[PDB]
Write a structure and sequence with these properties.
about 130 residues; mainly beta; about 10% helix; globular; binds Elaidic acid; ILBP
């Protein structure tokens, strides 16, 4: 997990609108979200990880242990059951609610952090650079 730790800024995004649409996020919030460039902070204290996502629009913070289910309230106000694990060197976050599921996968490639979000048929790729 150590190579993911630090402060990351968004530098590219593909298909985030499709992803938000698939989740049912309304047009007005999609507008503002398409113009926001979040900062993601990942820190560890022992076996507890904390992931903060800061922007001018909304902010989120979750703390979890790898492999242990937790309740999460997402930025779009879903209440889901979450689990984060390390899989092939990727940080894999699975959210489940109402019989549905979405995955948020983070991998390090050439020193950049690539976040892939999948729900239904929609796939979004977001690229973060280390600050
Ligand atoms: C919460 C801080 C950034 C919020 C941006 C707008 C959110 C609007 C609704 C989004 C629903 C999908 C939630 C997950 C998106 C994560 C984006 C990222 O970490 O790159």
């Amino acid at each position: 997990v150590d190579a993911f730790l630090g402060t990351w800024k968004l530098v590219d995004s593909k298909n985030f609108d499709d992803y938000m649409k698939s989740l049912g996020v309304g047009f007005a919030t999609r507008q503002v979200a398409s113009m926001t460039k979040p900062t993601t902070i990942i820190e560890k204290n022992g076996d507890i990880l904390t992931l903060k996502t800061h922007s001018t629009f909304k902010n989120t913070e979750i703390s979890f242990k790898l492999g242990v289910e937790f309740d999460e309230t997402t930025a779009d106000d879903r209440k889901v059951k979450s689990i984060v694990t390390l899989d092939g060197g990727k940080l894999v976050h699975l959210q489940k609610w109402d019989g549905q599921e979405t995955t948020l996968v983070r991998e390090l490639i050439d020193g950049k952090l690539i976040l892939t979000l999948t729900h239904g048929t929609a796939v979004c790729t977001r690229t973060y650079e280390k600050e």
